[PDB]
């Protein structure tokens, strides 16, 4: 096998020889299509044999790293991508048996004083193509992991001090670089460098905040959010951002150059007309928002009569509507029209770039070799310095850098001591949704076991500058020794405001806290202590820990603990479902089934005061809690719950003729009766234990069953589905009772006759 290994080594080295020789020969003269084709096949061939023996390829690459780095740096995209993939295969795919991969990484970093790696990073890591950005992200990850300490420090300082400023005005193209810096800076940077970076990022945040507050982005953001077009169409009559919208004959004589110039001249007029049409549509969009008429006309600068005819033909809408598309359909049509115009503008910009590139190539680059990379003038044509999305993305990058630097004590102190940084971050998160999540996360980091920061943020929440949701996020992470204060604040706010969002958040947090107990053993769960109400009252009113509750700084409102039960019948169905889920969860805890049963029995009386459309979740919760187990059914039967149910059914049936004669009242009556009958049937049906319960408790419900069945059967025109279901269930109960006790039924019928 050694002969085959030697043959493979000679073949690979010879292939590299041909690659270098052909690259030099092609670079000597102005090449063409055929000049780099065999280079591409040579690269493909050397790749196809590289995965067969990656160790030998690693050795070959380490011997001649500089040539491969130069080829990757200088050639066109097709060659450079393959060379970069070859380098990645050489570095990553080895087993790191010895130090060879370390030497290869060190030579890659050190080569030509780092000029080659700097050029590669500048070209690919923050480039237009996302796949190449991910590829270079992986390559940088491997090199940093596999290199020495000094080289790691050099590479990270190079990434932050040099590459990062270049990606300032590219929104999402600098994501991978920022990720790498945020991952590796706290491990290789000194404290002073981390503090300096934190100060720089704070300055960037302030500059972007001033830019956002100055150019009127807030009002236009609100306008686009209220119309439903979206935050990505902030300025759709503007020159398109090339980052956010990714989307001519070869001149030989002067006549073709004149034709190209004329084409450019016509394209300028076309672009101007398209932008004017977009401006008109934007004015119409604004008019749909403002409530005041007879609002004045808007005047546009036009180069010809095309715009007037376009708006004569296309400036129409439909008064007729199909409910409930009275608003959605016109907005969808408007979005379609604006999308068409915006796409046309984007293609026009691309065509202009291509025309100017061709003219420049003819004028100057008519003799340069085709093997060298051809730069694209993207920075001139990209209006990213005033793009809302790119500004928000750069703000997110700064926030990520601050979050990564928070691990240093000095950097954290600098962040906390800045001039109203926390308030500004909270306001920025509140105004714009795109920034809300990550900013909140940073706040959670600043709201760690520190107490003064939590007090400041709570004061800001009370003022109205920071959303309560931040605290909710802070309550979703464990190992925080200051969760009690935030829980107190959330509970107090839900108890006072009674807003749907606050109540929903508090109920979900409590339900999660109750559900978390399934992760421990039963012995730990059996250690719950049933403290009296005064303990929780002291916990809410004062500022003591839970273990110490065994001056009244805070004052509770009128009877405050009822809020939860009120949520059981809320008009918002999400709150209703949350409260009922919380009740069911409480029903499953240790020594707390009687508490849930008591809550159920206390709130049963609300069925007659609330519309039945609101009570449905409560009915489902009652069914579940009663159906928890057979032992629960027997215990509840001995407490005479069936007598209560039969009394409720009797009262409901007896008062029917007092109600109004309409469909709504009959529906409510049917739903209430169905709930009661279903509960009774569930209590008395099931296994043999339930049969024994029904047999034992048949003396006190037989006559009521018979007469209610007759009364329900006597209804012919005021029939609802729920009433039919109730009648069927009652008939089933009566038939099952009288199957083997016909004498009792006869006696009851005689007594009633």
């Amino acid at each position: 096998n050694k002969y085959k290994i030697m043959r493979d080594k000679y073949k690979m080295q010879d292939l590299l020889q041909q690659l270098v020789k052909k690259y030099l020969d092609v670079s000597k003269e102005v090449g063409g299509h055929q000049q780099l084709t065999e280079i591409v096949d040579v690269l493909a061939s050397i790749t196809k044999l590289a995965l067969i023996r990656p160790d030998m390829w690693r050795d070959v690459c380490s011997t001649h790293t500089t040539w491969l780095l130069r080829l990757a740096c200088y050639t066109t995209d097709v060659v450079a991508s393959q060379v970069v993939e070859l380098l990645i295969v050489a570095v990553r795919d080895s087993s790191v048996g010895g130090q060879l991969s370390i030497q290869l990484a060190d030579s890659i970093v050190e080569a030509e004083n780092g000029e080659f790696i700097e050029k590669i990073i500048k070209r690919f890591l923050i480039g237009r193509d996302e796949q190449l950005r991910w590829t270079l992200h992986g390559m940088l990850r491997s090199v940093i992991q596999l290199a020495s300490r000094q080289n790691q420090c050099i590479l990270v300082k190079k990434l932050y001090n040099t590459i990062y400023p270049l990606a300032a005005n590219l929104g999402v193209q600098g994501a991978q670089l920022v990720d790498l810096i945020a991952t590796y800076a706290p491990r290789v940077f000194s404290s002073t460098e981390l503090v300096a970076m934190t100060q720089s990022e704070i300055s960037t945040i302030e500059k972007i905040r001033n830019t956002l507050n100055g150019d009127g982005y807030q009002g236009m953001y609100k306008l686009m959010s209220d119309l439903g077009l979206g935050w990505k169409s902030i300025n759709f009559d503007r020159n398109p951002c090339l980052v956010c919208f990714t989307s001519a004959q070869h001149i030989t004589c002067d006549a073709e150059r004149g034709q190209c110039v004329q084409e450019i001249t016509q394209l300028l007029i076309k672009m101007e007309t398209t932008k004017t049409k977009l401006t008109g549509y934007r004015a119409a969009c604004e008019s749909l928002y403002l409530r005041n008429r007879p609002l004045p006309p808007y005047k546009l600068h036009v180069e010809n009569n095309h715009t007037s005819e376009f708006f004569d033909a296309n400036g129409t809408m439909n008064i007729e509507q199909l409910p409930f598309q009275s608003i959605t359909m016109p907005m969808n049509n408007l979005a379609v029209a604006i999308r068409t115009l915006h796409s046309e503008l984007c293609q026009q910009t691309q065509q202009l770039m291509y025309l100017h590139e061709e003219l420049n190539r003819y004028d100057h680059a008519s003799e340069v070799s085709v093997v060298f990379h051809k730069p694209q003038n993207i920075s001139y044509y990209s209006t990213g310095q005033s793009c809302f999305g790119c500004l928000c993305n750069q703000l997110l990058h700064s926030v990520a850098l601050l979050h990564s630097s928070c691990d240093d004590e000095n950097a954290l102190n600098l962040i906390l001591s800045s001039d109203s940084l926390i308030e500004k971050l909270g306001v920025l998160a509140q105004t714009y949704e795109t920034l809300r999540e990550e900013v909140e996360e940073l706040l959670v980091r600043l709201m760690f076991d520190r107490l003064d920061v939590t007090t400041k943020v709570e004061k800001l929440i009370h003022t109205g500058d920071i959303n309560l949701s931040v605290m909710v996020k802070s309550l979703m992470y464990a190992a925080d020794p200051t969760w009690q204060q935030k829980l107190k604040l959330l509970i107090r706010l839900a108890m006072d405001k009674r807003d749907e969002n606050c109540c929903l958040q508090a109920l979900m947090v409590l339900s999660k806290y109750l559900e978390a107990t399934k992760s421990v053993t039963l012995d730990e769960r059996k250690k719950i202590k049933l403290t009296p109400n005064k303990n929780i009252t002291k916990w809410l009113t004062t500022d003591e820990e839970w273990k110490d509750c065994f001056a009244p700084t805070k004052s509770l409102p009128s009877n405050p603990y009822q809020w939860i039960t009120d949520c059981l019948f809320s008009q918002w169905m999400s709150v209703r479902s949350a409260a009922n889920q919380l009740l069911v969860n409480l029903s499953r805890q240790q020594f707390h089934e009687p508490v849930a049963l008591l809550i159920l029995c206390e709130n049963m009386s609300k069925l007659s005061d609330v519309p039945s459309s609101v009570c449905d979740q409560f009915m489902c919760s009652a069914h579940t809690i009663i159906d928890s187990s057979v032992n629960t059914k027997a215990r509840l039967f001995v407490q005479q719950f069936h007598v209560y149910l039969i009394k409720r059914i009797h009262e409901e049936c007896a008062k029917l003729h007092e109600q109004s004669v309409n469909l709504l009242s009959d529906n409510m009556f049917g739903e209430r009766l169905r709930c009661f009958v279903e509960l009774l049937s569930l209590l008395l049906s099931g296994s043999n234990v339930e049969n024994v319960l029904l047999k034992a408790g048949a003396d006190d419900l037989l006559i009521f069953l018979l007469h209610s069945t007759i009364f329900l059967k006597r209804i012919m025109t005021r029939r609802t589905r729920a009433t039919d279901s109730s009648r069927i269930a009652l008939e089933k109960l009566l038939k099952r009772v009288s199957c083997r006790d016909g004498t009792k039924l006869m006696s009851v019928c005689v007594e009633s006759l």
Partner: protein
């Protein structure tokens, strides 16, 4: 199809109609009126079974083909909503890609004992908050006995109050539509062509 998601997901339906040392009584139970009334209604084996069940604790462990008007088994159907608020469209997932290396929102490192203590304390506080909402604060002398606890919780409501002497239900009035007749027809016609010339 990778561009279609399930935003409304039905779950499993819960059916409504189900498919059809010694243990001795305490002193309070023997003095309870309903208990003695029960003892004269069934045999002794049935009473023993009821008592054993009472005092014990359960061992806790596309296309549409069905028509709208079809008969079946009623139940409760829960729906889960995996939707996104419209105001949050295209937000909250900037670093959602798994290839990023920065330490994202992961849980903190905690020992088993500390985690268990924290979970238990949080559950205790939540249970106290929910329990304070009851109108009548329950007092449990012994919570390990389920029947005693349920009695102490529910005995003040007087669930056993029998309905009073019941009467015949008054029938609800029915929907009738009798078109009104002309009173003349149900009981002198002038000659229009006589005068007027």
């Amino acid at each position: 199809d990778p561009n279609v998601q399930q935003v409304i997901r039905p779950l499993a339906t819960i059916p409504i109609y189900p498919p059809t040392q010694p243990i001795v009584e305490d002193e309070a139970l023997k003095k309870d009126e309903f208990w003695k009334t029960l003892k004269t209604r069934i045999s002794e084996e049935d009473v023993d079974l009821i008592l054993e069940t009472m005092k014990s604790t359960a061992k806790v462990k596309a296309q549409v083909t069905t028509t709208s008007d079809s008969e079946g088994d009623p139940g409760w159907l829960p729906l889960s909503f995996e939707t996104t608020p419209i105001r949050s469209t295209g937000c909250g997932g900037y670093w959602s890609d798994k290839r990023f290396l920065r330490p994202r929102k992961m849980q903190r490192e905690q020992s088993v004992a500390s985690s268990n203590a924290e979970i238990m304390e949080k559950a205790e506080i939540a249970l106290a908050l929910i329990r304070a909402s009851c109108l009548h604060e329950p007092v449990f002398t012994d919570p390990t006995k389920p029947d005693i606890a349920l009695k102490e919780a529910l005995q003040h409501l007087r669930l056993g109050e029998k309905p009073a002497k019941m009467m015949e239900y008054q029938a609800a009035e029915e929907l009738v539509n009798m078109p009104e007749r002309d009173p003349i027809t149900t009981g002198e016609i002038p000659d229009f062509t006589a005068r007027g010339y």
